[PDB]
Design a protein around this ligand. Structure first.
Ligand code: CL
Ligand code: CL
Ligand code: ZN
Ligand code: ZN
Lengths: 189, 71, 71, 182
């Protein structure tokens, strides 16, 4: 039933990002991807910050993006044997990890002359994947709070921008986009 | 760290307006530079140089914005 | 050292001087405009000091970002 | 004789330089220093094919004055392009330093900022002097006289506005400074 409420409340806000997500004339790709990645990170961060009091251990006993999909934490050298985590714990680990990635002067240079690493696009795509996992969990489990908090428009706009960017540069496979493809097909028209 | 709803809503509206405006302004600087540079000049090498430094400045700006150098 | 062409240097110089005078005139305009509007509203001396602090901070920040690098 | 042109569509310059109301001195000096750094950089960049090892065997601002390198770490007798290479590289390293020239907002300037700023400005003026003395005719022929004089006029206006270079350093071009500043 979640799909039909999600597709009912798709209409949101009061423009076209599709031109704005495009790589500007003569702009380095890695820098663009980095900037938008950090931006989306902040967005999703405070977004989840709004409904964190609804997202408790009891409400979300396991990291779920709908009854069909269930995510497990891993893929970090520290804490490497996969753990069956709850919503707030998993999301905590995720956002903390991404935060540590963005704060790394090696992967995301702060100085001007410092160039990006060779494997930057990969970890960028990883980050974006996991951020989408957060998006999916919020959209599936804690959607009623978004409605009552009247944050529906802002959530849909943020997600729309995210999807426009990702699709613009093909940074997330559709297999990961699966839990929300029904919505993605609608927002991208 | 939890945020209030009104804060988030404001952030999103302000952010969207900022993105669209910044994009529009970028395209505006590019077009403006092209028009004035075309108006009373000039070799093609010079255009390439000016465009290169401008693009470098833009990339630097978005890098600083990425580096949260606004505080 | 990287060799720039003469047309580039000339163009940049011409554009730059005009930019300097314009930025000067605009700065003074913002300052005077703030002083007049804040005087009009009728405000405490502490409040006026606060507003001036914020304006000066915004300006100083502006030229700081412009210093390395901004567009 | 010989008119100095100057440009043209605008010139305030004096006014332009003045420290704005309630603006930090170090920030102003920093910004203007960076601007002048770029200006001089591409300026010398246009006539780089004339300032060669053969043409300028030593960094000279006239037969009276001769400059030698040593700071980056025993003075070295360098040519025009080599000396200027070392100079601009050094200043570049100073500007890229996050300690002396803060990029963040809250980060304040060090206490000894004015010193290295004045050093930078001295050496940049040394470049101005060398171009004006040795490689000046190409600037004329390239029709950059107006731009060179305007840049130098602005530079001198700034320096004089804040007393950042001693007259002993400005000596090789004092005859010109007296003319441009009227
Ligand atoms: Cl994974
Ligand atoms: Cl010295
Ligand atoms: Zn949850
Ligand atoms: Zn020379």
């Amino acid at each position: 039933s979640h799909q039909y409420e999600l597709l009912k409340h798709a209409e949101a806000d009061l423009g076209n990002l599709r031109m704005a997500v495009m790589l500007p004339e003569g702009e380095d790709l890695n820098e663009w991807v980095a900037v938008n990645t950090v931006d989306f990170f902040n967005q999703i961060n405070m977004l989840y910050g709004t409904i964190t009091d609804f997202c408790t251990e009891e409400s979300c006993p396991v990291m779920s993006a709908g009854p069909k999909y269930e995510y497990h934490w891993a893929d970090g050298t520290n804490i490497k044997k996969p753990i069956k985590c709850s919503a707030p714990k998993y999301i905590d680990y995720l956002m903390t990890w991404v935060q540590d990635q963005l704060d790394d002067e090696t992967l995301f240079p702060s100085k001007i002359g410092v160039p990006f690493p060779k494997n930057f696009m990969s970890v960028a795509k990883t980050i974006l994947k996991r951020l989408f996992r957060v998006y999916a969990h919020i959209y599936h489990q804690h959607f009623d709070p978004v409605i009552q908090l009247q944050e529906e428009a802002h959530l849909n706009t943020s997600f729309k921008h995210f999807i426009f960017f990702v699709q613009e540069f093909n940074l997330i496979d559709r297999r990961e986009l699966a839990p929300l493809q029904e919505l993605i097909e609608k927002l991208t028209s | 760290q939890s945020y209030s709803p009104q804060a988030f809503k404001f952030f999103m509206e302000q952010h969207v307006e900022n993105v669209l405006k910044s994009h529009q302004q970028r395209l505006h600087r590019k077009k403006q530079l092209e028009n004035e540079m075309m108006r009373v000049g000039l070799s093609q090498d010079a255009q390439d140089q000016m465009r290169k430094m401008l693009c470098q400045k833009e990339s630097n700006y978005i890098r600083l914005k990425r580096a949260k150098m606004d505080k």
